[PDB]
């Protein structure tokens, strides 16, 4: 429950992190205009990606590990090959098919890339063609975050709707309609069962759902919790819910009872991103303080 | 602890050296925010200065400038306005002769955008600079269509004094910031001279904010 190592090593306004598939590497995205692949154990960066557009708000590391996607409000999505023969990081193809801002891009697969953008829709993109195989539409507001299933077949997104909508990636169909949010969904995470998920937002409550139930299971609300939630993540075994807040500190709730299990009060600045390793070994916190620190 | 570890240390230090050099190179550039509405004179300001957002870069004397034209975002402003928190100045452009056009006059709704952007908590202390447009035809036409409560003459000088003051009087919590109103003739030679003096007035305050004395 205490900090084992601290990485830091950036300049300004770290927005997002995504854990690598090795459970050791992580990618750090910042508004500076530089993308960094970190390593947790040796605390030394392994790659630096310059950015044509400095404005980035999301990042993606492929579960293969071969590719890294970064986008922005430019409406242009960039996927970089880390392991080029030349050794430099080069953008595979520009991806400009949206009319808003690319709020979140993730990696369903190497060829099939899911991007949630601020054109009130999400679209499945191929690097080979640069065109939308399936486009997911039905959100009133602008989508900001999405959470893929471990199967990477049924995923959900949240917009300025006070609602979340599942999607089916093959036929481009909305699968479920989740409503029950009071405010705008800042971040959403998926339960690695593939059967449930929980979400938090600015309304200072984290809410537990199940995809097949389409019903709120229980709500995580506290009186001292007036600040909003901007990051949620789980444990590999449940019994836990990592959640960063607008109180400049993360917090931990039980997935079943949500007591004051873990108090995470490290960062001075607003915790922008929070992720759990794919084996669940560590907790990673990121913030605009140019700091990266990981606890255990 | 071998050749692999030593070489990894050298690459992880070389990356940080190049990173530090690039950061020091980037820190000199002045960041400017343009919030030009429809018919604000984006073409006029980009000419007089000479799918996503356009980033123009221009050099005046010994100081560079990077203005980020956020245009046609068509999105909720709050989700991305905090991205420009470190931007030194906010440029506003308003047309004056379109007070006979109701789509709820455009002047009144443009004030609300200024009212919202002034009272935001993110921009506690950011200098606000507003420029004007189409003032000549406003003289040619003019009162009752937009601001009948003025209840005075249709003289352009007093009417411009009324509009610019009440646009500046909308400030309620910007007492840290300074509204730098400039009456853009839309044909004046260098209205970046207003910007350069205003941005150096920020910079003089910026140093005096860091010297301790203010």
């Amino acid at each position, epitope marked *: 429950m205490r900090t084992r190592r601290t990485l830091r090593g950036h300049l300004a306004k770290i927005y997002a992190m995504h854990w690598g598939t*090795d459970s*050791r*590497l992580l990618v750090s995205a910042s508004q500076d205009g530089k993308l960094i692949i970190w*390593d947790s154990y040796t605390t030394n960066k*392994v*790659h630096a990606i310059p950015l044509r557009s400095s404005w980035v708000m999301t990042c993606a590391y492929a579960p293969s590990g071969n590719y890294v996607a970064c986008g922005g409000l430019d409406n242009i999505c960039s996927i970089y090959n880390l392991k080029t*023969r*030349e*050794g*430099n990081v080069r953008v595979s193809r520009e991806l400009a098919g949206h009319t808003g801002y690319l709020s979140c891009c993730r990696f369903l697969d190497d060829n099939q890339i899911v991007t949630s953008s601020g054109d009130t829709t999400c679209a499945l993109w191929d690097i080979e063609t640069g065109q939308q195989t399936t486009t997911f539409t039905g959100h009133t507001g602008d989508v900001m975050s999405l959470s893929l299933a471990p199967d990477t077949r049924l995923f959900v997104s949240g917009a300025c709707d006070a609602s979340a909508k599942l999607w089916d990636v093959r036929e481009g169909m909305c699968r479920q309609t989740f409503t029950g949010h009071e405010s705008d969904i800042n971040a959403i995470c998926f339960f690695p069962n593939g059967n449930a998920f929980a979400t938090g937002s600015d309304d200072a409550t984290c809410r537990l759902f199940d995809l097949r139930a389409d019903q709120e299971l229980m709500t995580y609300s506290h009186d001292n919790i007036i600040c909003g939630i901007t990051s949620v993540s789980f444990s590999k075994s449940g019994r836990l819910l990592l959640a960063g807040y607008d109180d400049f500190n993360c917090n931990v709730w039980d997935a079943l009872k949500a007591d004051r299990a873990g108090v995470l009060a490290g960062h001075d600045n607003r915790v922008s991103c929070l992720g759990v390793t794919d084996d669940g070994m560590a907790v990673a916190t990121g913030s605009w303080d140019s700091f990266l620190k990981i606890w255990n | *602890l*071998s*050749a*692999e570890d*030593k*070489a*990894a*240390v*050298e*690459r992880s*230090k*070389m*990356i940080d*050296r190049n990173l530090r050099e690039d950061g020091e190179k980037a820190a000199r550039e002045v960041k400017l925010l343009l919030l030009g509405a429809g018919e604000s004179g984006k073409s006029t300001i980009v000419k007089q200065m000479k799918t996503g957002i356009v980033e123009t870069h221009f050099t005046f004397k010994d100081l560079h400038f990077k203005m980020f034209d956020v245009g046609a975002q068509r999105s909720e402003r709050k989700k991305w306005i905090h991205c420009f928190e470190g931007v030194t100045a906010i440029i506003f452009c308003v047309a004056l002769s379109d007070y006979d056009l109701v789509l709820m006059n455009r002047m009144h709704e443009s004030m609300k955008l200024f009212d919202s952007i002034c009272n935001n908590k993110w921009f506690t202390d950011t200098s606000i600079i507003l420029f004007l447009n189409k003032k000549d035809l406003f003289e040619e036409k003019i009162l009752t269509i937009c601001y009948p409560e003025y209840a005075g003459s249709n003289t352009y000088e007093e009417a411009a004094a009324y509009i610019q003051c009440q646009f500046e009087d909308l400030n309620k919590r910007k007492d840290t910031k300074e509204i730098y109103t400039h009456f853009t003739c839309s044909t004046d030679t260098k209205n970046v001279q207003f910007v350069f003096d205003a941005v150096t007035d920020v910079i003089i305050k910026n140093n005096l904010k860091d010297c301790g004395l203010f």
Partner: single-chain antibody
Amino acid sequence: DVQLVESGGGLVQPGGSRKLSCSASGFAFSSFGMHWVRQAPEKGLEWVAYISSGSGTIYYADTVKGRFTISRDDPKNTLFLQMTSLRSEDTAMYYCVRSIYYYGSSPFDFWGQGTTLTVSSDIVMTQATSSVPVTPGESVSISCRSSKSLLHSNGNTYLYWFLQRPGQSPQLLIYRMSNLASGVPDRFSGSGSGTAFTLTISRLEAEDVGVYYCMQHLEYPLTFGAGTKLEL
């Protein structure tokens, strides 16, 4: 993709000096680590020198200290190495090497053509037999036998294995005991314990011929096996 061409590998007076350099293009040599590897004209690869990407760490071998020097050039994007006091042992077919270093990187992946230079403790690794007659389609095994264990305290060994084709530029087959290199068929696979190591060649055919090598990275001394011919 990448280009490594050595410049002027020729005759040297005994004990003299001569500038040798591998001209380079098409890769981030600024961010890349470089090596030079010698080949005696009959038998034996071993490491010579290493220059870092940031030119901060310089390491030489036992007969490379002082009398050999190294240097680089980033805008022209090439590498130099100056050799003085050249004798019969100093004569070798030196190979210009690039080698990127991080987690999962594949160092010693590409080579040049060579420097044809003719005039006029240490960890010990040896491959078990240097000549094995084979048949194109039956599985064989070859073992590089070290002297001390290769397993680091962090639990992951560092040990790289190589294939030299008959008279041309070599390749890397498997790096750090578990990871196959790009452009290499899966039929080649290394194995062994933390101290003993052996190759599992499966269903070989008529391009695997040539000398085979080990190399480690737990200690800076390499001194790997002198080679193993795999003759038809």
